[PDB]
Design a protein that fits this description.
The structure is a homodimer of 751-residue chains.
Chain A lengths: L5 H10 L5 E2 L2 E2 L5 E5 L6 E6 L3 H20 L1 H17 L1 H12 L3 H29 L3 E3 L2 E5 L5 H14 L3 E5 L6 H13 L6 E3 L4 H8 L5 E5 L2 H10 L6 E5 L4 E5 L5 H9 L12 E8 L3 H13 L19 H13 L4 E4 L11 E4 L6 H4 L6 E7 L2 H8 L7 E5 L3 H7 L7 E4 L18 E2 L4 H5 L3 E3 L27 E3 L2 E3 L6 E5 L5 E6 L3 H13 L8 H17 L1 H12 L4 H17 L5 E5 L5 E8 L2 E5 L7 H12 L3 E5 L6 H12 L7 E4 L3 H10 L5 E4 L4 H7 L6 E3 L10 H7 L1 E8 L3
Parallel strand pairs in A: 6-7, 6-9, 7-8, 9-10, 11-12, 11-16, 12-15, 14-15, 16-17, 17-31, 26-27, 26-29, 27-28, 29-30
Antiparallel strand pairs in A: 1-2, 3-4, 5-19, 10-18, 13-14, 20-21, 22-23, 24-25, 25-31
Bound molecules: 1,4-dihydronicotinamide adenine dinucleotide (2 copies) and sodium ion (6 copies).
The site of one sodium ion (NA) has 3 residues of chain A, from loops.
PDB class: oxidoreductase
Keywords: aldehyde dehydrogenase, aldh16, NAD, oxidoreductase, rossmann fold
Assembly: dimeric
Chain lengths: 751, 751
């Protein structure tokens, strides 16, 4: 006997045709479109396609309510707590409504979706309580536009709304056009929880309403959804000064070693088949099994797949629900029709909007199905021989979200996990989620983290704003020839290199004295720099202690030439350079200090074990330095970057390049390994787009302008970007460490 | 061919008879006693027995230099870095000198002692660099008296001096009377490193000079050495307001599971036989082997023990050196002569001050040798059947310092480790040490941590001092009888209990109105409370989420009665109680916030893997609340304690008990599990000594005075203590979380 939907149908009947939740109240229904129960084919309700006028109104209500909301964090905590209690009281109503709207088994909605949504609000209440005293240097961003997909409607809403509200922001959120209902119910309890009017605003519609939110007068955009829409959002927000987080999916690898717990590994994969749909952090879809056990593993997998029960999602004895929508069904069918590799195995499926669990095995690692996105309850599988080959196959995609590793051996599991490119790695489990544990992607899975103390950074700004210094025009001079040899080069791969293009410009002091010449880098020089950083990948695997020693040497050797550097700064700018040199020395010693002291966080979780929120290097970073602070700007950016294990290519000050070129000898005398620090001089108009575009860079920092061009071009590979503000005279070290690292969360057994 | 000591003998000849290093200079030699090379029997040098006048002078020089030293953390970093570089340049001299003085193999001094000492100074330089910006609410303590033992002379010095100096303190340190030389050489390089005069002071002598330092005008005492001297130091410093850390030894268990790597486990134990001497964090001496592999394991152990090379410690091909002193030799011989259990196996030993590696096997878990201290290169062994039995045998001593666990299984290793009572647990290794990883004991192994960010807390105070409110005398009244029933009880084990002694006192308001009666607890009531906390041990194993929910309930149910509580406060004190109630609610919501958010730290280390610096509950805590703040004082102390997993017994305000007694119903309505919170009322003169004495409490917090009595009585079981200052009107939550937790560092494979 399946579960009753009487209460949910009753709420739907009460609410009628839906408008939006704006400014604390329901607007009149507008231009209506149906949401349909995918299991019965019946219309559940009519919802509105928001107009531009609605989106403007919702953003204006969020703006009007935000400052009083931000003022009192203890009062925000009470509201988030009340929202969690209402989610718990109305648990059954939320679960049934999710199943009706989305098609998922009532048992998943009741045991997974709604419990985790409650926990997210319970847990984040406390961040609001603690923000004033524990994050005193942080402040709200303001208004957050939020857009989410159809696979986990309530949970995806909680992941967006709870940390935004906790940190004193207000929200305009649009659920997916296929799954609006539980967000509309969440709106309908906001009054009861004490949510002040206009702090939460829910508008419904398709991607066109999403586009209006993304380009609206908001301080933040947070998106979960497809990679392609992610790219367009990165482009539409380029140069606007908005904060941006993107969770873009990518279904992750499930590594099963020769000594894994076979039965638990099979069961974990089966229990994940229905869960692994849409753009969710998850593992299971790319099955990588050591060749010695692959046949036995696949044989058990097919049999356990046969035990999965398909049908009525309101039946708590059902494991496979209805596909979310006929279009999604057809996408799955088309994917299978488009594949010609492997051996397809399918359980039977009943009539209607159902698709059966499917295993496509016998793929070679190079097969497109191993690298393309996967849709539906579909598994693809390949084998490996050695753990190093498993790492290689797992990291050989454009994605990087979550991974799973199964081994009973204490070493193998803990040595494989950090080598996989992901924001999350589960050891002897999969799809483990907790509000205290950050989750999010690298590569084309996007950027940003949700959950934990770590997730709060994306919903705050520094309490005291800094301001990038204005550009400075290079000094001019008469143009007589230099009888002495004073033409600086570039610094690439541990040695000085002529610019590929052969050109250099004269550098003149404040009164037109010719000081020397500096090279003009081009794209071929940058590409040589990137190859030099690729050869220096070992630097990302060194100890913190080794990197500290290096930075101490750089600091020492700068001190030995401190007078020379100050006079070079004075020659170029006319201002005394001693204070800038003393501060550049200091920034090095601060970075040396930090190199072995930026700790990962151990999270307690209600599940098995603990979540280890590790810090990791971003990788290779291209950096454009400001005109001002010829030496301080370069060193302040370079030093925390390499302290944390990154390799960097810096475009030195365009107005005043000769301090950076004098620094070459400092790097050589300090034994900076080749490729760890590369330095380009010349016109930033020539380099900004190439550095932001480059497909083999993991981050671009543009602190000399060109923010729009840089942020737009970063969409090519969805690299992280930072375009300031950056004030060299301000010690940004601690914040730069955050720009220079990624969080990877490793879930391990414990206690 | 053994190593040359020409350079070390030359330095010894240059320095002559030794005075002390005081105020930046060497004092005249005084009352001389010899330090003797234990391998040759030859006198190495004469050193001075410091007088009281010397100790006064050294402390006065440390005091005179400290404030200018504390002012500039970047300059302190340069000095610590220079000290590390000098340790590295003179590495060979330090190593040889350590071997000459102590007897240890030159290979250990050169590969372990001196490298780790360098690393400690390199690593801690950075804390000095970062202190101003990253610990802005913290300030130096001032002058530190430091006393250390003979087993690792240079390394023990580095563990004391480097964090003290980094945090802006100055030091007076006394090495052990048997091993002064490398501390005197460390003194001899301080000038070259830029150590300003009087920032480091080294005085030599026996325990009588240690006694003078401990009771001198210093702000901190830090001791490593025997449990008995630790107790006397806790007593001599009782009531003085001095900070205190004690590292008291206890040789730790080495758990070898049925599925361990047998050969690596045996080798790790053999390579640890010589290392595990004196009061050092170490594991190996108590061998616990699963019964299925015990015979094969012991057979391999005896054979590998035979391969250990004994002789000339200046020979780099030697594993077993000379015993540190003839008295230590005799202590070992007496221990073996005193034992009658087990089967003793011994390798041969050569003539002189040598003792051979010894295995005493076949002990039952109850044998004294399994629980007493062990001396020399001696191993004792017993077997177990199940992992739970291994946990039981390992935790069945008065000690709790370090432990080792060997298993190839990913779960078993990570599930056994947190169950062992220790400050350190090594998985598939032993005696792993790093400057970033905290180490220190629980139980009779002492208290405090050395190393890492965590170790800095013991060398700092809050930058802004707070002040405990003055005592308040209970109001008096005429003494007419109460025709109504208004006699409050105690709250013990989840239910209200009459005081064992049967007595209660009348409570009068400011004008002599009889408000009711409050019970007078005695030692039998406290003992009932402790048994109630023992039955509530499960609370220490709950999730952070469960504990948060409980605290939220307490906060909610206090809010429901907020007017009643404010009027009760007003009845007792004559002052309006609304603000105290609102703040008591807030403290609960802050603690609820923190319950699932106080994260452990993941340390990068130059060795295999990572060090997980976990937070853990202290356990059972007895708390004495101040007179002032009848409700705020109790709640502010109770709530962070139970947020972190502790069970508590609080002695409520002596002047104003009736708010705490009204709180009983709040605990019952909030479903606080029985024994988690117990409340005693009555005279703190009756309870202070019993709570500080009690052998089954892990900590005592005395915030109502009696500091001397409490701190002295805490020496019985060497429980942690805190005697303030505590100002209820100040939000101490974050600092109380530190009082309410212990750090356990778990070293695990990784990458
Ligand atoms: N049978 C087939 O071949 C089907 C193809 N698709 C296609 O998949 C693509 C995206 O897949 P979905 O699962 O729908 O994820 P999505 O990325 O389109 O949706 C995630 C969220 O983004 C919103 N959104 C969509 N476009 C946006 C934009 N330009 N700006 C801002 N927000 C926007 C959506 O309304 C939704 O709430 C589309 O090209 C769609 O046509 C999906 C299903 C059927
Ligand atoms: N053959 C035997 O039976 C021997 C017995 N022992 C005994 O062991 C006990 C302590 O063992 P040790 O290894 O020497 O460690 P310890 O705890 O005595 O020494 C650690 C450090 O504490 C200093 N110290 C000693 N007493 C002190 C005090 N009252 N106040 C402050 N500092 C003090 C010491 O001088 C040393 O630098 C003593 O009772 C000693 O007589 C040690 C060796 C030989
Ligand atoms: Na629907
Ligand atoms: Na990315
Ligand atoms: Na857990
Ligand atoms: Na000696
Ligand atoms: Na203790
Ligand atoms: Na390591």
């Amino acid at each position: 006997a399946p579960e009753s939907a009487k209460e949910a149908y009753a709420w739907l009947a009460e609410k009628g045709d839906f408008g939006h939740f704006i400014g604390g109240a329901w607007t009149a229904p507008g231009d209506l479109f149906a949401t349909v129960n995918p299991a019965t084919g019946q219309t559940l309700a009519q919802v509105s396609q928001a107009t531009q006028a609605d989106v403007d109104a919702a953003v204006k209500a969020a703006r009007k309510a935000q400052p009083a909301w931000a003022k009192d964090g203890a009062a925000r905590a009470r509201v988030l707590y009340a929202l969690a209690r209402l989610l718990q009281k109305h648990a059954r109503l939320f679960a049934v409504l999710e199943t009706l709207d989305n098609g998922k088994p009532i048992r998943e909605a009741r045991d997974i979706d709604v419990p985790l949504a409650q926990r997210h609000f319970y847990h984040h209440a406390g961040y609001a309580q603690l923000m004033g005293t524990e994050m005193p240097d942080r402040a709200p961003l303001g208004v957050c536009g939020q857009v989410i997909p159809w696979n986990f409607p309530l949970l995806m809403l909680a992941w967006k709304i709870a940390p935004a509200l906790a940190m004193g922001n207000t929200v305009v959120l649009k659920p997916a056009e296929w799954t609006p209902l539980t967000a509309l119910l969440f709106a309908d309890i906001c009054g009861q929880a004490g949510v002040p009017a206009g702090v939460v605003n829910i508008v419904t519609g398709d991607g066109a309403v999403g586009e209006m939110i993304v380009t609206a007068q908001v301080d933040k955009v947070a998106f979960t959804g497809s990679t392609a829409v992610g790219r367009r959002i990165r482009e539409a927000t380029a140069g606007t000064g908005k904060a941006l987080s993107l969770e873009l999916g990518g279904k992750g690898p499930y590594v099963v070693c020769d000594d894994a717990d076979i039965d638990s590994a099979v069961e974990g994969l089966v229990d994940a088949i229905w869960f692994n749909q849409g753009q969710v952090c998850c593992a299971g879809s790319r099955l990588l099994v050591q060749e010695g056990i692959a046949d036995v593993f696949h044989a058990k997998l097919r049999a356990r797949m046969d035990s999965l029960r398909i049908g009525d999602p309101l039946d708590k004895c059902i494991d496979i629900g209805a596909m979310v929508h006929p279009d999604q069904l057809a996408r799955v069918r088309d994917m299978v029709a488009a594949n010609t590799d492997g051996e397809v195995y399918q359980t039977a499926v009943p009539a209607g909007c159902y698709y059966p669990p499917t295993l496509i095995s016998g793929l070679a690692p190079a097969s497109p199905l191993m690298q393309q996105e996967i849709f539906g309850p579909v598994l693809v599988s390949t084998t490996f021989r050695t753990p190093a080959e498993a790492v290689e196959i797992a990291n050989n995609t454009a994605y990087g979200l979550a991974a799973s590793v199964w081994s009973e051996n204490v070493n193998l599991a803990l040595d494989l996990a950090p080598k996989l490119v992901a924001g999350i790695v589960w050891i002897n489990g999969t799809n483990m989620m907790d509000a205290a544990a950050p989750f999010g992607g690298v590569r084309e899975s996007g950027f940003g983290r949700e959950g934990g103390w770590e997730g709060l950074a994306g919903y705050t700004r520094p309490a005291i704003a800094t301001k990038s210094p204005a550009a400075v025009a290079a000094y001019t001079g008469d143009g007589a020839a230099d009888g002495l040899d004073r033409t600086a080069k570039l610094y690439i791969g541990g040695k000085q290199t002529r610019p590929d293009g052969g050109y250099s410009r004269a550098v003149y002091g404040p009164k037109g004295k010719l000081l020397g010449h500096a090279s003009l880098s081009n794209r071929k020089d940058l590409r040589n720099a990137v190859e030099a950083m690729n050869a220096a990948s070992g630097w990302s695997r060194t100890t913190g202690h080794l990197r500290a020693q290096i930075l101490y040497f750089i600091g020492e050797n700068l001190s030995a030439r401190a007078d020379e550097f100050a006079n070079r700064i004075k020659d170029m700018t006319g201002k005394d350079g001693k204070a800038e040199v003393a501060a550049s020395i200091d920034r090095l010693f601060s970075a040396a200090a930090w190199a072995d002291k930026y700790d990962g966080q151990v999270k307690g979780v209600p599940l098995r074990g603990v979540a280890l929120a590790m810090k990791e290097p971003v990788g290779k970073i291209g950096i454009l330095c400001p005109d001002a602070a010829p030496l301080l700007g370069l060193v302040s950016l370079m030093a925390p970057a390499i302290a944390m294990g990154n390799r960097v290519t810096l475009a030195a000050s365009e107005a005043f390049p000769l301090a950076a070129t004098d620094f070459y000898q400092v790097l050589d005398t300090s034994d900076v390994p080749a490729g760890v620090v590369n330095i380009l001089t010349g016109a930033h108009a020539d380099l900004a787009e190439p550095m932001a575009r480059h497909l083999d860079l993991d981050a671009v920092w543009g602190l000399s302008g060109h923010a729009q061009v840089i942020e737009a071009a970063s969409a090519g590979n969805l690299k992280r970007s930072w375009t300031g503000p950056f004030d060299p005279a301000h010690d940004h070290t601690r914040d730069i460490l955050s720009h220079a690292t990624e969080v990877k969360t490793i879930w391990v057994p414990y206690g």
